[PDB]
């Protein structure tokens with residue numbers, strides 16, 4: 001149930017997502033999740049709930065439900081902290097909230113640096129994001145130092161397109177290769193090109209929004225719902241599983257890590273029950289065949305950043 005990273009650590013292939021989990025509900029959600037078997041939690045500073053996630057983690061270690069070494073805890077460096085001089089601080093405030101003394105994995109959350117400040121999305125009066133000078137090679141070096149200092153066991157990247165992943169891999173003096181690239185991926189955005197690139201380079205891919213992020217604040221009525229796709233429902237029924245379990249099992253069979261979010265205990269538990277069945281080889285190609293190149297996770301105010309990752313094909 002885990003995948004070996006290029007740092008020699010093992011990463012559970014199922015993790016719990018925490019974006020949009022309300023601060024008042026995520027502590028119990030992570031407690032239920034660890035009680036039912038999750039050992040990987042996907043966090044971020046920008047999700048504004050790391051303190052409450054960390055309460056849950058701490059209580060389960062105190063309770064001795066689990067050992068720290070059995071947990072795989074991931075967090076991410078927000079965009080307003082790309083400056084070489086800010087990265088360690090940002091890591092330590094995540095560690096502080098999570099009540100941890102190290103992370104298993106720490107990602108550059110997006111390849112785009114924003115102006116530092118306490119606003120997460122600094123905009124100009126016309127609504128464009130205000131970039132920071134910073135480039136991802138100096139940000140990367142700063143991430144490497146977090147390894148050297150023992151704050152993080154592994155480092156990786158998120159939302160990097162293949163030319164940006166290649167930028168890091170061709171970095172002069174590269175000390176630690178990225179271990180993971182965490183990207184949007186589901187039957188409507190199957191990412192074959194970028195996943196093959198990354199796997200070819202020994203970089204593990206984590207699939208985010210594997211259910212389509214139906215709770216994304218900017219969803220519109222017109223938008224498709226993977227959970228309600230009759231095709232996927234038929235595959236589900238054939239296996240006597242739910243559509244969600246199918247959507248979760250699908251990336252697992254492509255040698256991906258997948259991190260479905262829920263704050264509903266019954267769904268946390270259901271979503272983990274995906275080790276007891278297999279999708280067939282044909283199921284898998286059929287699922288891939290639903291690609292629409294429909295991306296749900298992005299932001300118009302950032303399209304003009306020099307490092308906006310989605311103008312490129314992949």
Ligand SMILES: NC(=O)c1ccc[n+]([C@@H]2O[C@H](COP(=O)([O-])OP(=O)(O)OC[C@H]3O[C@@H](n4cnc5c(N)ncnc54)[C@H](OP(=O)(O)O)[C@@H]3O)[C@@H](O)[C@H]2O)c1
Pocket residue numbers: 016017018019020042043109158159182183207208209210211212213214215227244245259260261262263264267268270271297
């Ligand atoms: N690196 C990045 O840039 C990035 C971007 C996006 C997401 N992520 C990570 O990926 C995680 C997952 O992506 P996501 O939150 O965007 O969306 P998702 O996991 O694709 O969708 C979560 C939505 O599905 C619902 N849901 C969960 N299990 C269900 C089930 N069994 N049946 C029916 N509905 C179910 C959840 O409802 P309830 O919660 O109400 O039960 C919630 O509304 C995030 O939380 C975050 O950790 C990272």
Ligand SMILES: O=C(O)Cc1nn(Cc2nc3cc(C(F)(F)F)ccc3s2)c(=O)c2ccccc12
Pocket residue numbers: 019044046047079109110111112159297298299302303305307308309310
């Ligand atoms: O970030 C998450 O985990 C979820 C996430 N996604 N988005 C959509 C985004 N689209 C982006 C595009 C770029 C870009 F790189 F393209 F410029 C940079 C930054 C972003 S944020 C949000 O606006 C957001 C806001 C609060 C908390 C989480 C998120």
